[PDB]
Design a protein around this nucleic acid. Structure first.
Lengths: 413, 55, 190, 214, 51, 125, 79, 240, 113, 33, 73
RNA sequence: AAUUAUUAUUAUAAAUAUUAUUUUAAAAAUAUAAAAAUAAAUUAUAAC
């Protein structure tokens, strides 16, 4: 009897005569509530022994007492938010005030030098985008400062857009204010608080996108495409005229092939296929509106749809060297494309999907469909899978509910 | 037991192969050219393609 | 002792000059050419709080400790010695195939500590594990009713998982794309 | 880290890092005689002890360590020192008006006076090395620092601050004299010198602004 | 519900129907009557809560 | 054509570009004043809106310039303890003395009237 | 298909009697039996609403009336 | 091929805590105190606690399906008994809400909205600013421009995260009054007895140094309160 | 995961000339286990046997009643008491088969009437 | 009804009675909608 | 040892494997359904399907078993 | 019975509800349990 100590959280054996316990299922150890007695503290409410008492206070001072604003303060606060045209004309000036001071990436041979740190401008940049709602990965603006071709184009595309924001006003703002201003009404939604809707992509709204691709140009130079795809396709809310719309629709599809998404590479290219031809087809931009909407199919393995778009690009646009080579690039896979044409053989090509299945993909011995099926955002243990009545699943033994015999079986209702 | 085990003696367990052949081993793998996830050779997906041909 | 009452302002330093409780400035015996001259102890600590905080943030890593992983630590360690040195591309790949929970614990942490580094400006490719440790954590205790009126206390041990993802550019990786030959009889059907 | 900052860091362990008398003294105990007379201070019975103590800062014998030796770090570091120990509210009343701030703010002006004499005395040896590969964007704030500390810009530090400040001054005018006939820095990526006009003009502007000051 | 009849319970219901240590006890003919104030305030001033 | 335009709906319904423009560059600016007078003291650092009327600061009115106490009694020491639960009658008289604190301690051991959302997981209903 | 309600019209009993025969006799009458302590219902958390095993299993509610007619006799039947 | 695993010593016998005597950290006053992650040594860039509520789906799924934990919904002992708190729990809850003591207020109340007061000690010793509001039951004061902080306003899906600067309640124990003549330290006592045609034959707040008294105003009652559909006018309350 | 038992996927081979599963697909199961499973998009209005549905429609229409819902929720109470983790409380439990939800399956429901 | 406050102190709402009054006429409440 | 290259395993899928060796000739009819090949596992000319252990066109002797001539990979 | 545990707690009433918890791809000892011989149910058997 009584080999260890006398506390209930002791280590060795005990006896119920000498040291009579109260049967405490699971209590907290001497070093704090582990993650097992907290599975109750957030579901049961209190520790499962019942003896401990649920001091839920400092959470109440975390959520509620923080989120309390009386009625006579609620309606007035929004009248006190900042003028994000300012933290757009102030941060962009500060963001530059650091982007100028970031070291030129070293160039010593024998070993790749390490890119400059990013804590310098992470704080102002956090302000720029947070008002724009287009979140940029610091790597884009950390490899850009590193690349010898982009360290200057990027920084100066900021100095110039900063110019075309401290000269004009934040035009994607007024677009939201002119809603509250047009459709004749004496209410403009403030005096527009952005200077001193039927416009096209304004000056800034073009230079805004300008540095976004120049942001997304550092992404490709580091080859992180599916974050670049969130940079380009986010600027897609900034073009309202179909000239630049097709340009930025060419950028997104010029970043979806690498990113691995070969379906959306068509759509982003098919819009480049309906907005491109307005200019003289002699420049290398004329042909580009169609190639992506047909290269994305030479990448999607359906060569017969691709065999027609490169045909439709021949008629309109006279000679696009890229579109010309795809005409013959489709003659090397013949017949190995058309003879060997199965409807399902899709040999996954790039890394953007090789990487996106290392994450977000099913695993083995965990995260598979045999561990915890999720159903309506709620995790269900593998048994309770409403998408199968296979063995193990509790649906095998539901019954018939005293209602109609709906089964012909004998031992298996 | 007849005594306690000093640390140099609890590590003695980890010398032989029966310990390394149970914990400290890494499996050869590869991306299924279709299923796109890592895989061992022999065990296949559920997709009708990952299951008709056997990558 | 009570820092709210036994030390009102830590920037000060109370003395007794001529039986007067006077509170001068607090200083520090910082270094010089070979002399020791006192500088403001609030200023001497504003540097370190920043010059260090500004030292680390410009170090290409992502230090990330996940506290209270629900598993024993003696068993968690043995299955972290496998990952020591593995590149993140081949640690999330080898944790996702082994059966043990300790690897499901790391993978979920090696994902949260992977996206967190992206917002920190580190590439997803050249990430390579640098340090990954296992400290004992807080414990629980089930009563273990046994026979003959005896009983014991099943302790449900948890652990911490401190991890730091260094970044090395020249980290070249072994080919894992290589489809086997027997699977390259995908020529049939295509 | 025992001894604190070998070369780089400001922090050290002197007369306030005590001697703990109750613990198993880790290393350098070559002989067992080293319990009643450890006789540290002797240089060889100290390198044994001092090395294995609190990590001689190395991040982990292969982990990433910080690049503090370079002008791209020291000088934008010194920017934050005086931009904190002397907030602009002191800089405005000093730079604009000559009137006395107050005794308090005059202490905060002298509290940070001898705070520059520290981060200098610690990180001066580093400043001279990366002066070679230092860049003009960073060679241009070296005078713009000693203003917010309110010191007229022009072994012991004084001998070495002079020659360095003379050394940088030329390298600034060289570059500024290298700018008037500036070669093509990038014929590609930015063959059009935009933002280079104003930013390098304001440099030539803000360079001579401190000259009359200094 | 505890049946045991307390001690201070009455000594507080004494002073709340008539000031106990100061004012004299109401005559029992009135005390045991429908005109005893605590009962008086009940036939003409009910206090219920029907929610 | 109008038939390939029908495919634009099939090409559509999978348009992922329209999940950003919800806030714009200025997610919202300070709305115009709702009324003429605000009830709360202005927040620091925030300049009062133009034209709105702020409550006054009714600063203390400007000032203009027998037996004090006999030490013949220590009766000053409270002859009813401050620890005793008060009479709860701010009228100026003891409210039922103890009789009625018990009626109003029901209001304490229970829930007060100002009481808003309690946080705990054992909730009344 | 066989429907109890469309069947009780052949037996004339009622809706709420044929069903009580095809679920345990604690979900209609007043005998001894324990349901499961998760079905008991909860409070209303900061996040989640309230519950009650008359709003969660309206079918499993005790038919205290049908117990009056079958298993317990009145006092006005033996006067 | 295999790994090393080099079993650790700290799993054999864990070194012990250094317990504080009289809650005193010994050489706190001796060496500098910086951000708790920089000289301490374990520097993480993002700590994650898994015992929180947000990360419940992350832990409740990591553990095996074979790890059944009973009493998910009902506890064993009776939990509707009334119980105290942990020792350390009260210690935290007594310091937060100290005014629950009997007579926590300051025995005479001399601090009023509109007073001219300067701070004395602590943060920013010596600033002058007029009171705007007083939290009487707490012995504290809201004073203009002194001890100003940023009251962050978390908001639901309608408004974003809003921050608002606002000076904070400071204790009256560390402020004194700006005498309208001497502008120095001056205690202020409610005083009785008549000097120069005092209306009630009494001064209302006397300065000791200069002697110019002060009044004690009245807190304001609500002027725009009342429901005309449910408020008996003052005359139906005046019909005897 | 429960027990490290390798799961095999046994199936019959020739299913193109089959009668009842002539064009069915088994990448993942149906939406709610009582529906005709996914079909190869080339064969939508393919005629299955007329009787292997009469044993299905007769069956897939017992999980459509309110009493089954009171089984589906009760089954959770059974589990959390039975210690199975990760089972959300029987309070917030979506019903299996609703009315409006079925219209999506009432889409390809114009075969014989 | 019982409940525990934020600290976790047991409190209760005064006991009551539920009286299902059988009315003669269907009564409702016209919630303004 | 300041820092080695990563401990990542090399591509051993192409080397001989005492476990895979038992599968070069393992009858597997009931494994595939539609896309049957002649002998899936057996890489002809190599030793045990090991694309790294190449042997074809090197001088051996097997007067009664076929052999393919050399080609690169 | 310390329990969500060897358990129909049965004073009474009863008779066609499929009325809803039991992992694992090896080998020995053991443990339960098992065709044949020195008119009955038995053996021993430390045999498949």
């Amino acid at each position: 009897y009584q080999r260890g100590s006398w506390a209930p959280g002791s280590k060795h054996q005990k006896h119920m005569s000498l040291n009579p316990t109260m049967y405490l299922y699971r209590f907290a150890g001497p070093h704090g509530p582990g993650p097992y007695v907290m599975k109750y503290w957030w579901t049961l409410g209190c520790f499962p022994t019942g003896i401990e008492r649920p001091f839920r206070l400092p959470e109440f001072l975390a959520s509620y007492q923080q989120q309390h604003v009386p009625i006579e303060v609620e309606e007035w606060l929004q009248c006190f938010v900042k003028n994000p045209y300012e933290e757009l004309k102030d941060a962009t000036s500060s963001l530059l005030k650091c982007l100028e001071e970031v070291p030129i990436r070293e160039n010593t041979r024998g070993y790749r030098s390490i890119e400059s740190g990013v804590s310098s401008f992470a704080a102002p940049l956090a302000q720029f985008e947070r008002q724009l709602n287009v979140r940029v990965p610091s790597l884009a603006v950390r490899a850009a400062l590193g690349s010898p071709a982009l360290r200057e184009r990027l920084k100066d595309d900021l100095f110039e857009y900063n110019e075309s924001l401290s000269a004009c006003g934040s035009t994607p703002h007024r677009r939201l204010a002119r809603l509250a201003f047009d459709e004749p009404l004496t209410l403009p939604g403030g005096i527009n608080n952005s200077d001193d809707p039927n416009p096209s992509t304004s000056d800034d709204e073009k230079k805004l996108i300008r540095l976004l691709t120049t942001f997304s140009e550092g992404c490709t130079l580091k080859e992180d495409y599916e974050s670049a795809f969130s940079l380009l396709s986010s600027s897609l809310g900034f073009s309202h005229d179909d000239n630049t719309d097709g340009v930025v629709h060419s950028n997104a599809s010029a970043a979806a092939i690498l990113g691995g998404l070969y379906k959306e590479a068509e759509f982003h290219g098919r819009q480049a296929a309906l907005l491109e031809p307005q200019a003289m087809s002699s420049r290398k931009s004329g042909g580009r509106g169609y190639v992506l909407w047909a290269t994305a199919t030479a990448y999607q393995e359906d060569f017969d749809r691709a065999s027609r778009i490169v045909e439709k690009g021949l008629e309109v646009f006279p000679d696009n060297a890229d579109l010309k080579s795809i005409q013959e690039k489709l003659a090397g896979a013949v017949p190995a494309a058309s003879s060997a044409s199965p409807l399902c053989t899709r040999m996954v090509r790039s890394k953007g999907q090789q990487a996106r299945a290392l994450l977000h993909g099913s695993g083995r011995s965990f995260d598979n469909e045999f561990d915890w099926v999720v159903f309506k955002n709620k995790l269900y243990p593998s048994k309770m899978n409403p998408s199968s009545n296979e063995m193990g699943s509790v649906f095998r033994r539901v019954g018939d509910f005293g209602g109609h015999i709906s089964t012909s079986r004998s031992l298996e209702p | 037991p007849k005594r306690k085990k000093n640390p140099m003696q609890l590590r003695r367990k980890t010398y032989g192969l029966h310990f390394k052949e149970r914990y400290l081993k890494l499996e050869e793998w590869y991306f299924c050219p279709l299923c796109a996830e890592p895989k061992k050779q022999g065990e296949w997906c559920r997709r009708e393609d990952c299951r008709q041909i056997k990558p | 002792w009570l820092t709210k009452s036994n030390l009102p302002d830590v920037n000060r330093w109370e003395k007794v000059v001529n039986s007067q409780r006077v509170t001068e400035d607090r200083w520090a015996l910082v270094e010089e050419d070979g002399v020791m001259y006192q500088v403001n102890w609030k200023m001497y600590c504003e540097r370190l709080e920043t010059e260090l905080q500004k030292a680390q943030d410009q170090l290409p890593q992502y230090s990330f400790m996940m506290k209270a992983v629900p598993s024993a630590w003696k068993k968690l360690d043995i299955e972290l010695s496998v990952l020591r040195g593995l590149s993140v591309r081949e640690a999330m790949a080898q944790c996702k195939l082994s059966p043990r929970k300790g690897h499901m614990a790391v993978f979920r942490a090696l994902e949260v500590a992977q996206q967190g580094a992206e917002g920190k400006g580190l590439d997803k490719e050249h990430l390579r594990i640098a340090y990954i440790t296992c400290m004992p954590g807080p414990t629980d205790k089930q009563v273990d009713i046994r026979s003959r009126g005896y009983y014991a206390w099943k302790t449900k041990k948890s652990s911490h998982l401190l991890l730091t993802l260094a970044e090395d550019p020249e980290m070249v990786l072994p080919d894992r794309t290589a489809i086997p030959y027997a699977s390259l009889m995908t020529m049939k059907r295509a | 880290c025992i001894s604190g900052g070998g070369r780089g860091d400001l922090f050290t362990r002197h007369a306030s890092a005590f001697k703990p008398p109750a613990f198993g003294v880790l290393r350098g105990l070559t002989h067992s005689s080293q319990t009643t007379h450890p006789q540290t201070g002797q240089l060889r019975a100290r390198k044994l002890i001092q090395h294995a103590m609190h990590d001689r800062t190395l991040s982990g014998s292969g982990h990433h360590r910080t690049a503090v030796a370079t002008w791209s770090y020291l000088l934008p570091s010194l920017r934050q020192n005086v931009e904190q120990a002397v907030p602009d509210t002191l800089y405005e009343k000093l730079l604009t008006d000559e009137v006395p701030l107050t005794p308090a703010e005059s202490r905060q002006l002298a509290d940070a006076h001898r705070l520059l004499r520290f981060e200098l005395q610690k990180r001066i040896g580093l400043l001279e090395d990366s002066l070679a590969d230092a860049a003009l964007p960073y060679l241009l704030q070296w005078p713009a620092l000693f203003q917010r500390a309110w010191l007229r810009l022009p072994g012991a530090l004084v001998p070495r601050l002079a020659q360095l400040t003379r050394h940088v001054i030329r390298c600034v005018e060289e570059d500024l004299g290298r700018l008037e006939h500036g070669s093509e820095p990038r014929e590609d990526g930015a063959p059009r010198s935009r933002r280079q006009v104003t930013l390098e003009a304001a440099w030539r502007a803000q360079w001579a602004s401190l000259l009359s000051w200094h | 519900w505890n049946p045991i009849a307390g001690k201070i319970g009455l000594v507080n219901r004494k002073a709340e129907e008539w000031g106990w240590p100061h004012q004299r006890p109401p005559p029992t003919g009135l005390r045991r009557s429908p005109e005893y104030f605590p009962f008086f305030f009940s036939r003409y001033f009910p206090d219920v809560e029907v929610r | 054509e109008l038939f390939a335009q029908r495919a634009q709906r099939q090409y559509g319904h999978g348009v992922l570009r329209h999940i950003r423009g919800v806030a714009g560059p200025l997610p919202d600016g300070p709305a115009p004043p709702p009324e003429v007078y605000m009830p709360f003291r202005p927040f620091v650092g925030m300049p009062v809106p133009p034209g709105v009327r702020t409550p006054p600061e009714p600063t203390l009115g400007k000032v203009l310039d027998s037996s004090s106490t006999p030490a013949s009694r220590d009766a000053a020491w409270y002859e009813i303890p401050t620890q005793f639960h008060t009479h709860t009658y701010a009228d100026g008289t003891p409210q039922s003395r103890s009789a009625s604190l018990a009626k109003a301690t029901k209001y304490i051991h229970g829930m007060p009237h100002n009481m808003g959302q309690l946080y705990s997981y054992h909730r009344p209903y | 298909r066989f429907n109890l309600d469309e069947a009780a019209a052949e037996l004339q009993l009622d809706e709420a009697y044929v069903a009580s025969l095809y679920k345990p006799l604690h979900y209609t009458y007043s005998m001894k039996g324990q349901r499961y302590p998760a079905e008991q219902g909860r409070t209303s958390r900061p996040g989640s609403l309230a519950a009650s095993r008359d709003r969660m299993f309206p079918l499993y509610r005790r038919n205290y009336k049908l117990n009056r007619e079958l298993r317990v006799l009145d006092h006005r039947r033996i006067s | 091929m295999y790994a090393r695993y080099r079993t650790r010593s700290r799993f054999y016998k864990r070194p012990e805590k250094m317990l504080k005597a009289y809650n005193v950290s010994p050489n706190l006053l001796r060496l500098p105190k910086v951000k708790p992650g920089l000289l301490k040594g374990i520097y993480t860039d993002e700590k994650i606690d898994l015992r929180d509520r947000e990360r419940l789906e992350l832990v409740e799924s990591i553990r095996h399906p074979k790890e059944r934990d009973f009493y998910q919904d009902h506890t064993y002992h009776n939990q509707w008994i009334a119980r105290d708190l942990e020792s350390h729990q009260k210690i935290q809850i007594a310091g937060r809400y100290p005014y629950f003591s009997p007579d926590y207020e300051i025995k005479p109340w001399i601090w009023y909205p509109g007073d001219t007061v300067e701070v004395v000690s602590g943060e920013g010793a010596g600033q002058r600013g007029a009171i705007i509001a007083v939290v009487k039951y707490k012995n504290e004061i809201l004073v203009q421009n002194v001890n100003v902080q940023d009251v962050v306003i978390p908001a639901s899906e309608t408004r974003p995260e809003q921050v608002v600067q606002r000076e904070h309640p400071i204790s009256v124990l560390r402020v004194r009054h700006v005498d309208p003549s001497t502008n120095q330290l001056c205690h202020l006592e409610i005083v009785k007895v008549r000097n120069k045609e005092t209306g009630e034959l009494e001064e209302r707040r006397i300065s000791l140094e200069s002697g110019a008294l002060l009044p004690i105003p009245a807190p304001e009652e609500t002027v725009e309160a009342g429901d005309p559909l449910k408020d008996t006018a003052i005359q139906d309350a005046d019909e005897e | 995961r429960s027990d490290n038992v390798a799961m095999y996927f046994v199936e019959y081979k020739n299913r193109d000339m089959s009668d009842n599963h002539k064009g069915e697909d088994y990448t993942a199961g149906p939406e709610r286990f009582f529906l005709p499973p996914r079909i190869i998009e080339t064969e939508k209005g393919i005629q299955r046997p007329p009787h292997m549905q009469m044993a299905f429609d007769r069956w897939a229409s017992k999980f459509k009643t309110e009493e089954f819902h009171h089984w589906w929720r009760l089954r959770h109470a059974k589990l959390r008491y039975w210690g199975v983790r990760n089972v959300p409380h029987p309070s917030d439990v979506d019903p299996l088969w609703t009315e409006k939800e079925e219209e999506e399956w009432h889409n390809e429901m114009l075969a014989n009437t | 009804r019982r409940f525990k406050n934020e600290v976790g102190e047991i409190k209760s709402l005064p006991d009551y009675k539920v009286a299902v009054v059988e009315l003669d006429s269907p009564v409702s409440i016209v919630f303004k909608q | 040892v300041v820092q080695r290259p990563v401990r990542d395993p090399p591509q051993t899928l192409y080397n001989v494997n005492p476990i895979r060796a038992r599968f070069v000739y393992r009858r597997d009819k009931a494994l595939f359904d539609k896309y049957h090949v002649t002998a899936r596992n057996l890489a002809p000319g190599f030793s045990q399907g090991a694309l790294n252990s190449d042997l074809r066109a090197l001088g051996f002797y097997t007067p009664d078993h076929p052999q393919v001539p050399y080609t690169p990979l």
